[PDB]
Amino acid sequence: IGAEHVNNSYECDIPIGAGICASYQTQSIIAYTMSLGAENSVAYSNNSIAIPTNFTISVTTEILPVSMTKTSVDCTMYICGDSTECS
Amino acid sequence: GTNTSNQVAVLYQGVNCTEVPSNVFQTRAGCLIGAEHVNNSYECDIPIGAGICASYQTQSIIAYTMSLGAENSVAYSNNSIAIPTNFTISVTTEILPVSMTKTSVDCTMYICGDSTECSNLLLQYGSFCTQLNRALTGIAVEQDKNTQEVFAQVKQIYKTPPIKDFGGFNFSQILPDPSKPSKRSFIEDLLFNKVTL
Amino acid sequence: QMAYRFNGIGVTQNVLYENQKLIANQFNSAIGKIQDSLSSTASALGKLQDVVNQNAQALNTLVKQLSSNFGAISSVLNDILSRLDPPEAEVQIDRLITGRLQSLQTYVTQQLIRAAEIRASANLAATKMSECVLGQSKRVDFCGKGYHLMSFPQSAPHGVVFLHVTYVPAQEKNFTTAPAICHDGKAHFPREGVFVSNGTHWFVTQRNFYEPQIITTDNTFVSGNCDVVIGIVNNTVYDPLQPELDSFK
Amino acid sequence: AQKFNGLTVLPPLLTDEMIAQYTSALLAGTITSGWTFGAGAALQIPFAMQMAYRFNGIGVTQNVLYENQKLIANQFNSAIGKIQDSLSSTASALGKLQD
Amino acid sequence: VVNQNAQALNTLVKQLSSNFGAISSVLNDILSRLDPPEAEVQIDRLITGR
Amino acid sequence: LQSLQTYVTQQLIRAAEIRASANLAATKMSECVLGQSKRVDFCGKGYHLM
Amino acid sequence: HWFVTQRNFYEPQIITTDNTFVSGNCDVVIGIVNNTVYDPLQPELDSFK
Numbered sequence: 001i002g003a004e005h006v007n008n009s010y011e012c013d014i015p016i017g018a019g020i021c022a023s024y025q026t027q028s029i030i031a032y033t034m035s036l037g038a039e040n041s042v043a044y045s046n047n048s049i050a051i052p053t054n055f056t057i058s059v060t061t062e063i064l065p066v067s068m069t070k071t072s073v074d075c076t077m078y079i080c081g082d083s084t085e086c087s
Numbered sequence: 088g089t090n091t092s093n094q095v096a097v098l099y100q101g102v103n104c105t106e107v108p109s110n111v112f113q114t115r116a117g118c119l120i121g122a123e124h125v126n127n128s129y130e131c132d133i134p135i136g137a138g139i140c141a142s143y144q145t146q147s148i149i150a151y152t153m154s155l156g157a158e159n160s161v162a163y164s165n166n167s168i169a170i171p172t173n174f175t176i177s178v179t180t181e182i183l184p185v186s187m188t189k190t191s192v193d194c195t196m197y198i199c200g201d202s203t204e205c206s207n208l209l210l211q212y213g214s215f216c217t218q219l220n221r222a223l224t225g226i227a228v229e230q231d232k233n234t235q236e237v238f239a240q241v242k243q244i245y246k247t248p249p250i251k252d253f254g255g256f257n258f259s260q261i262l263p264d265p266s267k268p269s270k271r272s273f274i275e276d277l278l279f280n281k282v283t284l
Numbered sequence: 285q286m287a288y289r290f291n292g293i294g295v296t297q298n299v300l301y302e303n304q305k306l307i308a309n310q311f312n313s314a315i316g317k318i319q320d321s322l323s324s325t326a327s328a329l330g331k332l333q334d335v336v337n338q339n340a341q342a343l344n345t346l347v348k349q350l351s352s353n354f355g356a357i358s359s360v361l362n363d364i365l366s367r368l369d370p371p372e373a374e375v376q377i378d379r380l381i382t383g384r385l386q387s388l389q390t391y392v393t394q395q396l397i398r399a400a401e402i403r404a405s406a407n408l409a410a411t412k413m414s415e416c417v418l419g420q421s422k423r424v425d426f427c428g429k430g431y432h433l434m435s436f437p438q439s440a441p442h443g444v445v446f447l448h449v450t451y452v453p454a455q456e457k458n459f460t461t462a463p464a465i466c467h468d469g470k471a472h473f474p475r476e477g478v479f480v481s482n483g484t485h486w487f488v489t490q491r492n493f494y495e496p497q498i499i500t501t502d503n504t505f506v507s508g509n510c511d512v513v514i515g516i517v518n519n520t521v522y523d524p525l526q527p528e529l530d531s532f533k
Numbered sequence: 534a535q536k537f538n539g540l541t542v543l544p545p546l547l548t549d550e551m552i553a554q555y556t557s558a559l560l561a562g563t564i565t566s567g568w569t570f571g572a573g574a575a576l577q578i579p580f581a582m583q584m585a586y587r588f589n590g591i592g593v594t595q596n597v598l599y600e601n602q603k604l605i606a607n608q609f610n611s612a613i614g615k616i617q618d619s620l621s622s623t624a625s626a627l628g629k630l631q632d
Numbered sequence: 633v634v635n636q637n638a639q640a641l642n643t644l645v646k647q648l649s650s651n652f653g654a655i656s657s658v659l660n661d662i663l664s665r666l667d668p669p670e671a672e673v674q675i676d677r678l679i680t681g682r
Numbered sequence: 683l684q685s686l687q688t689y690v691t692q693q694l695i696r697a698a699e700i701r702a703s704a705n706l707a708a709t710k711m712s713e714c715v716l717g718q719s720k721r722v723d724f725c726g727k728g729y730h731l732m
Numbered sequence: 733h734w735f736v737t738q739r740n741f742y743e744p745q746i747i748t749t750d751n752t753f754v755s756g757n758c759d760v761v762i763g764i765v766n767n768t769v770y771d772p773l774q775p776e777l778d779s780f781k
């Protein structure tokens with residue numbers, strides 16, 4: 001409740017489920033079916049080839065974690081709190 | 088298996104079995120009864136342990152030592168080579184799971200089942216259920232990422248051309264068929280009818 | 285494209301063109317055989333069915349634990365609340381709550397472990413997709429047994445199915461071989477392939493397919509005198525320039 | 534290990550003899566046929582040519598092997614002996630299994 | 633990763649304020665108000681939860 | 683029962699490490715023994731032969 | 733003197749048309765040097781006399 005259903009399709013902003021996603025139109029919340037991507041047909045033939053004539057070099061960034069913070073907890077102090085009888 | 092026969096064999100693990108009270112065969116994994124020991128060796132049908140496996144002869148159950156495979160000696164020489172003169176192409180199938188069912192469980196209805204006093208007694212235990220719900224949500228959300236990173240590696244949706252002049256190769260069994268309503272391929276359709284809950 | 289892919293596995297691109305019909309027929313027969321083998325079940329899809337069974341069985345085991353007693357007089361909470369006074373019902377409600385909470389914690393831990401296992405499998409599947417489908421792998425046994433050519437993906441209810449197309453040699457013959465040829469006191473080595481003989485004459489043939497050629501300066505190179513090489517043989521080499529020079533008369 | 538008080542250990546399916554036989558078969562295959570047996574039927578070939586192929590794959594021409602076969606064989610033999618000596622010196626390289 | 637470690641640590645710290653069916657969540661109050669032969673039955677139920 | 687459950691959970695955790703190591707060992711066997719890996723530092727330092 | 737050698741092992745060869753290929757004039761390449769190259773066909777052409 002509170003979303004408007006539309007005919008169009010775009011990339012998913014907020015996942016809902018079963019192929020439905022929601023986004024902000026910029027000024028109401030709309031719901032739409034996901035669009036998988038642009039559609040085109042390649043010009044296949046049995047005697048045709050395509051050869052590039054120019055090139056561009058590009059740089060991309062990828063990030064990976066390697067470690068996390070080292071922590072230690074004293075069992076007796078946490079459970080009892082320097083308590084003789086509790087210990 | 089019941090559909091094959093009704094004869095069964097019983098294995099007592101780790102027992103000398105002189106005190107266990109037909110056929111009685113001693114085995115390093117404990118002796119078994121109802122089986123006949125044989126000289127021959129075959130591939131393992133049912134693993135028992137310590138290199139011993141059992142199978143149905145076809146009308147009796149036999150136990151034998153495993154056979155690793157056929158033995159052959161290559162004709163090695165210091166001036167001899169072997170070169171193939173013909174080739175055969177083959178297709179093999181490999182299957183890998185990618186995701187599992189997404190489930191979510193609430194404490195309050197499971198433990199207390201809408202009882203008010205149970206809910207009052209439950210809240211003094213702290214935040215166990217916040218942790219449980221967070222863990223289940225974290226499990227559920229990463230299932231979609233697994234499907235997202237395996238498929239969807241192509242940016243644009245390419246379509247097959249109308250004419251199938253592929254130099255004599257026939258891809259009709261794997262290309263999608265527009266007539267059948269789910270728009271799946273023949274093999275993909277055959278796959279979905281074989282898995283049941 | 286087939287000509288490109290044969291070149292990647294160290295086989296010259298020409299041999300495809302004299303055997304295109306045979307390769308196409310073999311491919312079609314292999315596809316039909318995969319279809320028939322998939323029709324005849326041999327527990328091939330067990331890797332998905334077992335996962336479904338372990339999820340369902342764990343869930344169902346979680347369900348039956350709601351009927352456990354855990355030391356109470358009865359497992360039905362409504363009976364407890366409608367049969368006893370609160371200050372004496374509490375000493376039953378607490379233990380029932382503890383039992384149910386422990387069961388839920390165990391279920392959550394098992395799901396946590398299984399999720400990590402499934403995610404590792406999914407990472408492997410994505411790596412194999414990117415490796416075999418969008419390119420031609422060189423690492424062995426990663427996209428099937430034999431020399432990998434291409435792969436095709438198919439959908440599964442909770443996974444993915446790959447169809448690997450590989451190149452396998454079929455039948456072989458054995459010959460006498462030598463590491464180098466000595467002519468005019470100079471050693472000769474092949475640019476590609478090796479020297480083979482049928483007992484009377486020597487030839488040069490491909491790595492993975494028998495196709496003889498006459499030994500020529502074009503496909504051989506010279507490096508030093510031939511006394512140092514162990515096992516060298518004593519045969520001549522042909523040079524195409526001499527007949528052309530003679531014909532210039 | 535020991536067994537008592539309701540806990541038992543189970544023998545593995547494959548014994549050490551079968552594992553040793555598998556390793557011996559793999560070693561014989563890789564020293565008598567190169568990489569051919571991994572793809573299909575094993576094809577016999579002399580070892581010097583196989584070393585020449587493996588040299589040719591790392592960007593080094595195969596002619597340098599035949600001109601230096603004795604030196605390479607001696608270096609390999611010395612390296613094998615050094616590896617054999619190193620493990621016998623009670624070095625704690627086996628920590629991973631012991632842990 | 634940093635947030636998911638920090639939240640787990642904070643939730644671990646906050647669990648020390650739970651009561652677990654005792655008369656008080658502070659152990660000093662438990663051993664300062666009660667005689668130990670009937671105070672151990674109050675201490676143990678905090679110990680188990682922690 | 684709590685002690686037994688803790689032991690079972692610890693074994694379940696360690697089994698994943700053992701399986702990952704076994705998968706890595708199998709991959710290394712297949713790539714370095716049955717062929718000639720062109721891949722750096724996967725079958726030892728330097729250019730791999732056999 | 734200039735030579736041609738392998739990538740990972742020193743083995744100098746005489747620069748020859750047989751192990752080199754030609755592409756474009758030498759005005760665009762930065763750092764090109766000024767040296768001769770050998771052609772093996774000339775002695776054989778001289779041999780026809």
Ligand SMILES: *[C@@H]1O[C@H](CO)[C@@H](O[C@@H]2O[C@H](CO)[C@@H](O)[C@H](O)[C@H]2NC(C)=O)[C@H](O)[C@H]1NC(C)=O
Binds near residue numbers: 054055
């Ligand atoms: C190939 O692409 C490059 C850049 O991708 C082209 O170089 C540009 O050409 C335009 C044409 O007017 C200039 O305005 C730019 O200054 C050039 N450089 C850059 C960095 O954009 C080039 O012309 C293309 N064609 C060829 C044959 O190289």
Ligand SMILES: *[C@@H]1O[C@H](CO)[C@@H](O[C@@H]2O[C@H](CO)[C@@H](O)[C@H](O)[C@H]2NC(C)=O)[C@H](O)[C@H]1NC(C)=O
Binds near residue numbers: 174175309
């Ligand atoms: C190489 O193998 C192919 C098949 O693997 C052979 O082709 C068959 O040859 C037999 C011999 O008469 C024919 O009856 C079949 O019709 C052929 N085709 C098939 C699909 O079986 C071929 O003869 C073998 N030899 C060569 C040199 O190619």
Ligand SMILES: *[C@@H]1O[C@H](CO)[C@@H](O)[C@H](O)[C@H]1NC(C)=O
Binds near residue numbers: 005006007
């Ligand atoms: C989408 O378009 C169809 C006609 O093509 C129309 O009947 C339908 O109402 C549209 N959807 C919405 C939400 O208006």
Ligand SMILES: *[C@@H]1O[C@H](CO)[C@@H](O)[C@H](O)[C@H]1NC(C)=O
Binds near residue numbers: 090091
């Ligand atoms: C039982 O075994 C027979 C004989 O092998 C086989 O034909 C049949 O398919 C099996 N299953 C059933 C349900 O009969």
Ligand SMILES: *[C@@H]1O[C@H](CO)[C@@H](O)[C@H](O)[C@H]1NC(C)=O
Binds near residue numbers: 103105
């Ligand atoms: C079983 O017990 C008998 C009698 O004590 C003994 O002789 C025999 O060796 C035992 N079996 C084995 C495998 O040790």
Ligand SMILES: *[C@@H]1O[C@H](CO)[C@@H](O)[C@H](O)[C@H]1NC(C)=O
Binds near residue numbers: 124125126
């Ligand atoms: C198996 O063969 C051995 C001889 O190698 C023989 O002594 C033994 O009796 C045979 N087993 C059976 C069950 O006949």
Ligand SMILES: *[C@@H]1O[C@H](CO)[C@@H](O)[C@H](O)[C@H]1NC(C)=O
Binds near residue numbers: 251257258259
């Ligand atoms: C491909 O195979 C199917 C099934 O055998 C057949 O119906 C179809 O005609 C074949 N395609 C061609 C181009 O022959």
Ligand SMILES: *[C@@H]1O[C@H](CO)[C@@H](O)[C@H](O)[C@H]1NC(C)=O
Binds near residue numbers: 162458459
């Ligand atoms: C070729 O292989 C066969 C089969 O092992 C062997 O008998 C023969 O000696 C080998 N050599 C020749 C020249 O036939």
Ligand SMILES: *[C@@H]1O[C@H](CO)[C@@H](O)[C@H](O)[C@H]1NC(C)=O
Binds near residue numbers: 482483484485
């Ligand atoms: C070897 O091949 C040549 C090729 O022309 C042929 O003349 C000769 O007879 C062959 N020898 C044998 C022993 O087959």
Ligand SMILES: *[C@@H]1O[C@H](CO)[C@@H](O)[C@H](O)[C@H]1NC(C)=O
Binds near residue numbers: 165166514515
């Ligand atoms: C091995 O090669 C040498 C020459 O390199 C030869 O004399 C010898 O006969 C060969 N070995 C056999 C068993 O033929």
Ligand SMILES: *[C@@H]1O[C@H](CO)[C@@H](O)[C@H](O)[C@H]1NC(C)=O
Binds near residue numbers: 518
């Ligand atoms: C090889 O042939 C040449 C030709 O004159 C001869 O001088 C030499 O002795 C031969 N060597 C062998 C090992 O047959």
Ligand SMILES: *[C@@H]1O[C@H](CO)[C@@H](O)[C@H](O)[C@H]1NC(C)=O
Binds near residue numbers: 762763
């Ligand atoms: C770099 O090369 C240029 C010619 O290409 C030369 O003039 C210059 O001296 C070189 N740099 C140094 C530091 O020598």
Ligand SMILES: *[C@@H]1O[C@H](CO)[C@@H](O)[C@H](O)[C@H]1NC(C)=O
Binds near residue numbers: 766
């Ligand atoms: C290279 O040599 C040619 C030969 O005459 C000459 O014309 C040219 O100026 C020289 N270039 C340089 C940079 O020395």
